[PDB]
Design a protein around this nucleic acid. Structure first.
Lengths: 189, 172, 136, 191
RNA sequence: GAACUGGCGAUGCGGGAUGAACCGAACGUAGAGUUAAGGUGCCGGAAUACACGCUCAUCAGACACCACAAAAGGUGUUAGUUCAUCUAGACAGCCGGACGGUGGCCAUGGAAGUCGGAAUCCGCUAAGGAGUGUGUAACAACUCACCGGCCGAAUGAACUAG
C-alpha cells in the first residue's frame, strides 16, 4: 500500500465527518457549466462517478464512509459518485453581484423560442459568412433600417447540431442555452 | 518411404597412428531403414562437427524398441525447419502411444500446416511429460479430464455392392 | 403442460463400452475400450477373444450398446477379470445381433443336401401357414 | 482446437412451455404460441428437468460453435417475446413540411399511408404483417408504437418503414426529416 | 554471338490446340515382365480404401521446362514466435480533471493561452494541462488523460507462414 493511502487513508480519513449530499448526473449538458458552479469556491469539488472496487473495499472493510447512502441500495449499476462537498447555497444571490461577462455556452444548441434580435451597426467588414444556400436569411438594408423578406425556422428540440453555423451570427455576448435545472438530490443529514 | 522406425547410431572418426582412441560420438535418429538412418546420422555429423565420410567409421547401429507400448503418453517435440521465406524454431506436443507414431503424425501435421517436406525438417528432441497441469495447448489439454463421454455422429458406411433397395439411414 | 424432448440419446465412446471390429487381422472379435487419446485413435483389448493389445482408428471399429464399469489405464490382467466378472457373453449372444450373425454363417456354410431338406421343409411350412390363413 | 463437446444452458419459467420436433420448435405461453424451423445447423437439445434445456454441439470450428450461442439467443429472445411481449416506439421529426400519416384498411390488407413528406403528392404506401398491431400514442406529440409477440416481424416492419422514409438529391446533412426508432422494450415491465 | 556435352534443315515422338530447336531418343517378323522424364469416376485399359489440415471461391483450384502474376494489404481460417497481467480477481455495463505562469514581446489614449518570428518545467506529487481543433482581423474560448459503484475467469499487445 503506497499510492492508495493518498486517496483513501488521506483525503477520506481526514474528512470523514461530512453529512452533505449533492447528487447530480451529467446526462447531456456542457460539462463546464455545472463544473465551474460546483467549483468557483475551487478546491472542494471533484466528480467521482466511480467504478467497481468494492470487492477490495469489503476485503479491507472498515470504512463507514457515508451511512446516509442507504436509499438507492439496489442500484449497483452505474452508481452515482462519492463526491465530498459542504458548500452553502445562499452565496450567489448576495456575495457575488454584477458578473455579466461570463462565457457563452457551446454556441449551436437549440433555443426555446423563435426570436430575431435587431442588429445595430458597428462599422466592420463582412467576414466568412458565404454559407447559406440551403435555407438562408432573406434581408434588405437601407441605412440601418433593415427589412426581412421571409422567415425561416431551422430545427426543434430533440436533434443534434450542425458543424459550421456558429461563426458570426450571435455577436451579442449571450449564452444561448444554459437556463436549466439538473440535479438528482440536494440534502443534508 | 514407409512406416517409421528409429535407431541409435555410434560413430568414431577412425583413429590415427599418433592420436588413437577418438572420442566416440553417439546419436539417436528417426528413419525407415538402417541405411538411410546411418546416412542421415552422418549428415548431422557433417553439419555439427568437422569429419567426412571418407574419414570416419560407424562403430555401432541398434534398432531400439520403446518400453511400454500400452501407456498412452504426452510427448513434447522441438523442431527447426525452413520455409518459403525463412527458417523457424517450433515446439509442439502430442498425445500418442509411441515415439514412432508420434513422429509419423508430426510429419503429416507439418506437411499439412507448413508444406515442410522431409528434406527440410530435423528434430531437436522429443521428450515425455509425465505429470498433469503441464501441457500448454488447448488442442491436447481436452482429454485429461474425467469421463470423455461423446459420440461421433453421422456414422457413414460404404457398400461393397453398388445398388441398394432400402435407402439406408445414418443412425448411430 | 410439459416441456417434452424426445431423447437425443445415441451410443457414445467411453471406457467400458465393448466394441466390435469389421476389417483387419482379428476381423470380427469383440474387444473392450480401455483408454482414449483423441477423436480417432484409441487402444482396445480383448484377451479372452484372443486379440492382442494395440491401437486402432475408430473408423476401423464398430460400436455396441453394452458396457460396464472400468478404471482408466488398466491392462490385460484387470480387463480380462472384469470382462469375465461382468459376463458380457451371457447377454451378447442373447441379443438380436449375434443370433443373426450365426444365422448368416450357418446359411452360408450348409451344403446341398441340407439345402434340399430346407426346401422340402419350407414347402411344409408354407402349406401349414396357408392352411390356417385361407379359412381365417 | 476442435472443441469435442460444448454446450449452453437455457432456462424456461413454469408458466410457458416448449415442444421440439426433430427440427421444428414450438413455444406456447399465456400470450400465445410461436413456432420456428431450425434446418440451418442441426445441433442437439437435451432436457434436464422441466426448467433447463441444454443446447449442445460436438466437434466443430469456431464458425460451427458460434451458431450454438446464436440459436441460444434466437430461442431465449423469442420465448422472452412470447412470455413478455415486445414493443418499439418510433418518432416523427419535420423541419417545415409536417408529415401526415394514416392507417387504411382495404380487402383485409391494412396498409399505412404517408403524405406531405418533403412535398410529395402521390401515395407513399407500406404494408403490415400479422401478429403485430399499432396505436397512435395519445398524450404525446409525433410518435408511433409497434407492439407484438415475435421480434423478427416487428423489427423488420419498423426497419422497412424507416427505410422507406428516405430522400435523395438534397443536402446530405441539413435535411434530417423522417421516421426512426427510439425505444425498444416490452409490453409488460420487470416480468 | 560462343565453350561443354546430349540435339539438327536432310534426323522418325509419351503432354498439351500439331512438331527442327518445350526432357532430346538410336530403329528385324510373328515372340516374357516392366516403362522410356506416367496416371487410375468418366475423355478408358485399371482401387470411388487408408491420417491432419484450406475449401466457400458472388473469376476457387488441377501436376516440368508448357502457355503464368506483383502495387499494397485482410478480428477471413489454421499453426507458431515474442512480450507483458491474472483465484493479493484487472478487461468490455458512465464521468471529469484548466493553482502561478494561460493577463509572456514589436517609435510610453487601448492587444486576455503564437495573423507577419524563439520555448514547452517546476513547488505541488487519486483531482490538478500554456495543448491534435481553437467566434468580432486575441478582449466574451468548450470537449479529453494512472482515480474512484456488483458478479466471477482467461484475457491483452506485436510479429511469423499455410
Amino acid at each position: 500500500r503506497e499510492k492508495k493511502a493518498e486517496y483513501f487513508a488521506k483525503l477520506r480519513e481526514y474528512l470523514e465527518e461530512y453529512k452533505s449530499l449533492f447528487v447530480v448526473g451529467v446526462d447531456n449538458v456542457s460539462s463546464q457549466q455545472m463544473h465551474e458552479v460546483r467549483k468557483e469556491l475551487r478546491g472542494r469539488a471533484v466528480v467521482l462517478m466511480g467504478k467497481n472496487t468494492m470487492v477490495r473495499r469489503a476485503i479491507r472493510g472498515f470504512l463507514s464512509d457515508l451511512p446516509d447512502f442507504e436509499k438507492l441500495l439496489p442500484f449497483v449499476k452505474g452508481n452515482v459518485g462519492f463526491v465530498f462537498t459542504n458548500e452553502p447555497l445562499t452565496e450567489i444571490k448576495n456575495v457575488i453581484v454584477s458578473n455579466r461577462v461570463a462565457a457563452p455556452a457551446r454556441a449551436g444548441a437549440v433555443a426555446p423560442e423563435d426570436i430575431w434580435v435587431r442588429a445595430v451597426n458597428t462599422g466592420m467588414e463582412p467576414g466568412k459568412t458565404s454559407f447559406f444556400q440551403a435555407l438562408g436569411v432573406p434581408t434588405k438594408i437601407a441605412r440601418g433600417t433593415i427589412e426581412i423578406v421571409s422567415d425561416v425556422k431551422v430545427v426543434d428540440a430533440g436533434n443534434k447540431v450542425g458543424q459550421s453555423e456558429a461563426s458570426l451570427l450571435n455577436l451579442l455576448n449571450i449564452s444561448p442555452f444554459t437556463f436549466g435545472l439538473t440535479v438528482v438530490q440536494v440534502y443534508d443529514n | 518411404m514407409a512406416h517409421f522406425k528409429e535407431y541409435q547410431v555410434i560413430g568414431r572418426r577412425l583413429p590415427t597412428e599418433s592420436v588413437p582412441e577418438p572420442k566416440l560420438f553417439r546419436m539417436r535418429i528417426f528413419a525407415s531403414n538402417e541405411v538411410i538412418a546411418k546416412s542421415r546420422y552422418w549428415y548431422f555429423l557433417q553439419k555439427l562437427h568437422k569429419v567426412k565420410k571418407a574419414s570416419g567409421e560407424i562403430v555401432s547401429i541398434n534398432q531400439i524398441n520403446e518400453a511400454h507400448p500400452t501407456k498412452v503418453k504426452n510427448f513434447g517435440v522441438w523442431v527447426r525447419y525452413d520455409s518459403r521465406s525463412g527458417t523457424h524454431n517450433m515446439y509442439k506436443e502430442i498425445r500418442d502411444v509411441s515415439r514412432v507414431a508420434a513422429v509419423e503424425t508430426l510429419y503429416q501435421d507439418m506437411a499439412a500446416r507448413h508444406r515442410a517436406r522431409f528434406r527440410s525438417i530435423h528434430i531437436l528432441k522429443v521428450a515425455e511429460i509425465e505429470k498433469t497441469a503441464d501441457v500448454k495447448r488447448q488442442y491436447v489439454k481436452q482429454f485429461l479430464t474425467k469421463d470423455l463421454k461423446f459420440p461421433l455422429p453421422h456414422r457413414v458406411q460404404k457398400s461393397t455392392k453398388t445398388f441398394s433397395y432400402k435407402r439406408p439411414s445414418t443412425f448411430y | 403442460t410439459d416441456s417434452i424432448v424426445k431423447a437425443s440419446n445415441w451410443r457414445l465412446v467411453e471406457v467400458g463400452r465393448v466394441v466390435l471390429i469389421k476389417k483387419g487381422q482379428s476381423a470380427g472379435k469383440l474387444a473392450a475400450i480401455v483408454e482414449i487419446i483423441d477423436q480417432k485413435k484409441v487402444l482396445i483389448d480383448g484377451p479372452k477373444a484372443g486379440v492382442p493389445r494395440q491401437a486402432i482408428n475408430l473408423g476401423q471399429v464398430v460400436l455396441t450398446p453394452l458396457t460396464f464399469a472400468l478404471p482408466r489405464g488398466a491392462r490385460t490382467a484387470t480387463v480380462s477379470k472384469k470382462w469375465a466378472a461382468a459376463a458380457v457373453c451371457e447377454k451378447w449372444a442373447a441379443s438380436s445381433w449375434a443370433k443373426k450373425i450365426a444365422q448368416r454363417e450357418r446359411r452360408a456354410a450348409l451344403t446341398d443336401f441340407e439345402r434340399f431338406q430346407v426346401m422340402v421343409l419350407r414347402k411344409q411350412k408354407r402349406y401349414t401357414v396357408k392352411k390356417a390363413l385361407a379359412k381365417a | 482446437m476442435k472443441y469435442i463437446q460444448t454446450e449452453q444452458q437455457i432456462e424456461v419459467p413454469e408458466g410457458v412451455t416448449v415442444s421440439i420436433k426433430s427440427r421444428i420448435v414450438k413455444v406456447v405461453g399465456p400470450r400465445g404460441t410461436l413456432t420456428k424451423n431450425l434446418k440451418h445447423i442441426d445441433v442437439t437439445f437435451t432436457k434436464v428437468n422441466n426448467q433447463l434445456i441444454k443446447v449442445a454441439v460436438h466437434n466443430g470450428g469456431r464458425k460451427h460453435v458460434a451458431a450454438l450461442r446464436t440459436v441460444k439467443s434466437l430461442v431465449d429472445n423469442m420465448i422472452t417475446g412470447v412470455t413478455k411481449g415486445y414493443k418499439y416506439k418510433m418518432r416523427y421529426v419535420y423541419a417545415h413540411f409536417p408529415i401526415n400519416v394514416n392507417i387504411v384498411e382495404k380487402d383485409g390488407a391494412k396498409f399505412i399511408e404517408v403524405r406531405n413528406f418533403l412535398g410529395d403528392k402521390k401515395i407513399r404506401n407500406v404494408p403490415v404483417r400479422d401478429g403485430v398491431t399499432i396505436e397512435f400514442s395519445t398524450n404525446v406529440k409525433d410518435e408511433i408504437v409497434l407492439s407484438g409477440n415475435s421480434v423478427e416481424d416487428v423489427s423488420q416492419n419498423a426497419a422497412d418503414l424507416q427505410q422507406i422514409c428516405r430522400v435523395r438529391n438534397k443536402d446530405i446533412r441539413k435535411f434530417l426529416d423522417g421516421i426512426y426508432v427510439s425505444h425498444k422494450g416490452f409490453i409488460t415491465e420487470d416480468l
